[PDB]
Design a protein around this ligand. Structure first.
Ligand SMILES: *[C@@H]1O[C@H](CO)[C@@H](O[C@@H]2O[C@H](CO)[C@@H](O)[C@H](O)[C@H]2NC(C)=O)[C@H](O)[C@H]1NC(C)=O
Ligand SMILES: *[C@@H]1O[C@H](CO)[C@@H](O[C@@H]2O[C@H](CO)[C@@H](O)[C@H](O)[C@H]2NC(C)=O)[C@H](O)[C@H]1NC(C)=O
Ligand SMILES: *[C@@H]1O[C@H](CO)[C@@H](O[C@@H]2O[C@H](CO)[C@@H](O)[C@H](O)[C@H]2NC(C)=O)[C@H](O)[C@H]1NC(C)=O
Ligand SMILES: *[C@@H]1O[C@H](CO)[C@@H](O[C@@H]2O[C@H](CO)[C@@H](O)[C@H](O)[C@H]2NC(C)=O)[C@H](O)[C@H]1NC(C)=O
Ligand code: F23
Ligand code: F23
Lengths: 534, 534
């Protein structure tokens, strides 16, 4: 069977899956249970010598995406699904979840020095795990290209377990636990991947949605010092939908509001030492308490209950400011979007149908925005159903008179104009950007959020030449054009540059275009980004 | 353990589920495999003495709802789900599927002489089984009411296995195999239910969607002679969404068109004896061939590949004409609808966006309708998005300019105006009718097809007082009003009667109204119903 020697000299065994060799479920941290809840992960101390790693371990605990303090049929439906024996059997969860997964080409030996693609899964900072992002399609393609890579997927804590915030968390130094899980995994790769056939000096970190925003967070982490034992932890990044998190600090308003609701819901409202009270609760009590706070499909939508926040320590400030001010690691990057990122999320506010109600939803969601800033937003993103998302669909997809508008705002603030802001300010390396229109015409959803996961991990489609081939080429050669694409991918310098600067995808293939759309919306959101933070 | 003696003297054992006693998986026919495929069911000949019946048997073989001779991602997506080990373990399927299920109140003994509610599941005549229609809610409520009932659910063949048609089937006398399965199960109840505590002379047949249409078929079966050994097989019927099947005979155009496609797809196109060739094929071959014919969610939509059809033998003619001409059993009935029956089915034609395209879709679907009849239809069901389904939603739900229109037509022809035709012509017994608006405001779907299953079998909602209490009272006393409803349920005489004749449901409970809506569409469809047959 496949084997590998770890840094400490432990020899572990993996799975010959014929199409790849997999070392799955390797612990990299002590179980963050009991009194270690919410805290920085502790490096794994024991020996793994002679053990077998041939199946994925459990996910970290998962929040109901329709969780909320309200009662409703959607919360109930997903709860029944996620609690079923059937679900629990296929996708088990546990607080003892800090595992890492290494999947390499067949026959790869220690010393192969292959480039490493280190995947950070996305799930709203509230669900997901490595288990549901199969690496085989990427690994197999890499071999076919003559550019073999090793895929590494790190598990990290989500929801309350990973992103609890508020004053107590800040004062203890425990902000952004799940990002610290990711970071420790990156360090694990630095120290251990060589014995699997990987080159620790050729790690590309990549992720989608919350995983893409995590990649950004890794760029600005420790004001962009990405060094470990004197060497950079990664040499490139790929961001599939998401850059800066538009978030207030850990000890800000909504981090404390969620913390107070979580504490109360967990039965710890009378405690003088609330974090100790939480650490003492049963796992079920914390799960129920988490599901009593909004999940990312609830009405609150992308005003997330759990997400990375500046903590004044490892994320030292407003992430837009960090990028503006140069506080990032210097690496080349790819960053891109799906055309209609916001549509799934717009399905969460379908009781908002009038202009006045849309205004009230925006004001509830954007607690820092002035009436004048909301006016500017609502001028830039008008009710006119032809101008919203799914873009370029005219009078189609009008579920309500506001759905396409709300979708457009959501998609641009959370992902598409966030990307443009990043690209206009980031000078740390060569930049490439894409915009997919692969599913134009798909009713209601359009080219929706995370469809790229399908084409990257599950099926072959026109976009697979980007999500697999170009990304492998980038990870290998720091240039996606060594993939031999049928269209040259131009470098991105700014949204004002004279020529085409986006790699575009449609159902029939590749072409190029410009990042010069919805400029009024960009100006409304990005003149003062912190006015639209959550 | 619970036990029951069958008519042949065999004693069988069931399950004490505490909230009911269940005898699950009882064979009532010989396995319709091999040379018995598509044929009438053969009564089961073996002994069951001493056997245990404590879990559901497999479903009959299921067609992919997105099946088609075309390739597309939806068809693919559902195939991979239905083929997964996880699905196959929870919901197994087999051609050896002719089982019946008896679920009775706790402590019920032989001799209890309880009313029987005989459930006929729905699934488009293409999917479904008794397994996913849990009887516990009904049975528990009946005890609570002091009107205990026994719930019996019969399995029957669906899709090609149950409703293959065309010239060869007609000539053999093998039409409507799955209705024959149901009928044999009714005979089984007549002969055997007394041993379980049931009164065979107090059977009410009930079903939803294809099961509701099946109830109508049982009313007109053998020109309305519903006896077995000289005794009626049932004394009442309840139709949850669906009455007459608007279908041409077994040997008409589309029955032959589907047969030819099935034969060809099964590798039997060169056969002189096509039925013998099909009967010789492997199970997987017939499954793949079936999935190469449209399923009810494919573009063809409710122009079903598989459905009951007049056969000149047991369904002797056009079922609208049978009802007009009085060729039905004289029993009282309940029949009703969900307000927005058509919306799920309108999701299957979202590439239909212009009036010309709508016209073409209607003409493809209704091969017998003249251009004048299509003109009349498209005047009665205008493009005007405010007039379509979800009804009473104004400019909302406009996925396309035709979605609400197509949904309205589908809903009215297949279910809502079909019910009104039935009610206006049926004089076999007292009639009661309901219309649910329980989910008014639900985006896109409205009060959608089959939502009543939720409130009947899974959750308590305002409609449960009809789908459980009133139906129990009707099966007990042939009058839903013995349930002590908060609103008296008026008898239905005709759609022109002077007073309110519909029991209505909304989220907050019961009220009454009139069956006098969309009269232009009734006239367009029902002046000559056979012009709109499939
Ligand atoms: C988060 O930031 C803190 C504070 O800068 C880091 O803590 C420092 O760690 C270095 C090691 O390079 C020590 O020499 C310093 O004394 C520490 N400073 C303080 C104020 O404690 C910490 O390592 C960072 N955590 C991660 C996971 O990067
Ligand atoms: C749309 O529905 C949401 C979710 O129910 C409504 O917001 C809730 O409204 C109730 C009633 O005021 C409050 O108790 C909850 O705290 C609200 N939840 C959240 C997360 O805000 C919302 O008011 C509805 N919007 C419109 C325009 O009707
Ligand atoms: C379907 O209709 C046929 C035609 O009436 C029924 O066939 C009769 O069956 C009886 C008893 O089984 C025979 O004695 C007659 O000879 C048959 N008549 C003819 C002309 O075929 C058949 O029973 C009906 N099937 C069901 C299940 O009701
Ligand atoms: C909507 O899509 C359907 C399904 O693909 C189209 O119907 C198919 O059209 C192809 C191309 O002509 C034919 O080869 C298939 O036989 C058709 N299938 C069926 C079941 O009819 C349909 O034409 C499209 N409608 C519009 C308005 O574009
Ligand atoms: C109009 C309402 C405005 C709501 C506030 C928006 C501004 C705050 C945005 C905060 C960042 C949220 C997004 C973080 C990425 C996760 C989105 C959930 C993705 C779920 C799919 C998971 C996946 O497959 O990756
Ligand atoms: C505009 C397109 C017109 C299409 C032709 C319509 C006329 C033919 C109607 C034929 C009868 C179809 C209906 C039979 C009932 C089944 C409908 C599928 C239900 C799937 C849900 C199953 C369930 O849970 O019950």
């Amino acid at each position: 069977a496949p084997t590998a020697k770890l840094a400490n000299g432990d020899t572990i065994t993996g799975l010959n899956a014929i199409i790849n060799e997999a070392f799955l479920g390797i612990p990299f941290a002590e179980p963050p249970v009991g009194n270690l809840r919410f805290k920085d992960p502790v490096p794994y101390s024991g020996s793994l010598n002679g053990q077998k790693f041939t199946s994925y371990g459990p996910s970290c605990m998962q929040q109901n995406p329709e969780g909320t303090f309200e009662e409703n049929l959607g919360k109930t439906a997903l709860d029944l699904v996620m609690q079923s024996k059937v679900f629990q059997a296929v996708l088990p969860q546990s607080e003892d979840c800090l595992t890492i997964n290494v999947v390499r080409p067949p026959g790869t030996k220690a010393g192969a020095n292959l480039p490493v693609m280190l995947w950070i899964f996305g799930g709203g900072f509230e669900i997901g795990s490595p288990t549901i992002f199969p690496p085989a399609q990427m690994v197999t393609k890499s071999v076919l290209m003559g550019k073999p890579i090793i895929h590494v997927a790190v598990n990290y804590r989500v929801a309350s377990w990973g992103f609890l915030a508020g004053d107590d968390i800040k004062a203890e130094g425990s902000g952004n636990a799940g990002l610290k899980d990711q970071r420790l995994g990156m360090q694990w790769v630095a120290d251990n991947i060589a014995g699997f056939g990987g080159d620790p000096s050729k790690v590309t970190i990549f992720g989608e949605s919350a995983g893409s925003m995590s990649v950004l967070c890794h760029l600005i982490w420790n004001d962009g010092d990405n060094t470990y034992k004197g060497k950079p932890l990664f040499r490139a990044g790929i961001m599939q939908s998401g850059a800066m998190v538009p978030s207030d600090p850990v000890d800000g308003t909504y981090g404390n509001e969620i913390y107070d609701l979580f504490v109360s819901s967990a039965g710890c409202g009378s405690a003088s030492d609330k974090l100790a009270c939480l650490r003492s609760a049963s796992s079920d009590t914390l799960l129920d308490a988490t599901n009593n706070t909004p999940g990312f499909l609830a009405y609150s939508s992308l005003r997330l209950s759990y997400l990375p926040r500046p903590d004044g320590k490892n994320i030292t400030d407003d992430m837009y400011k960090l990028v503006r001010d140069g506080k990032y690691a210097s690496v080349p990057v790819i960053i891109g979007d799906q055309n209609d990122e916001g549509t799934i999320f717009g399905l969460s506010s379908l009781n908002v149908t009038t202009n006045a109600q849309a205004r009230a939803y925006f004001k509830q969601s954007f607690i820092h925005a002035s009436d004048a800033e909301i006016d500017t937003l609502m001028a830039a993103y008008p009710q006119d159903i032809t101008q919203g998302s799914p873009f370029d669909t005219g009078i189609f997809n009008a579920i309500t008179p506001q759905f396409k508008r709300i979708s457009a705002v959501l998609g641009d603030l959370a992902f598409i104009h966030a990307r443009r802001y990043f690209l206009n300010h980031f000078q740390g390396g060569t930049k490439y950007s894409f915009l997919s229109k692969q599913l134009s015409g798909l009713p209601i959803m359009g080219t929706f959020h995370a469809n790229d996961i399908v084409w990257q991990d599950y099926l072959l489609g026109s976009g697979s030449v980007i999500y697999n081939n170009a990304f492998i080429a980038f990870a290998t050669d720091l240039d996606p054009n060594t993939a031999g694409l049928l269209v040259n991918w131009p470098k991105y310098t700014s949204s004002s540059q004279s020529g085409n600067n986006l790699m575009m995808i449609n159902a029939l293939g590749l072409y190029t275009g410009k990042d010069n759309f919805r400029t009024a919306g960009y100006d409304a959101l990005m003149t003062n980004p912190s006015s639209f933070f959550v």
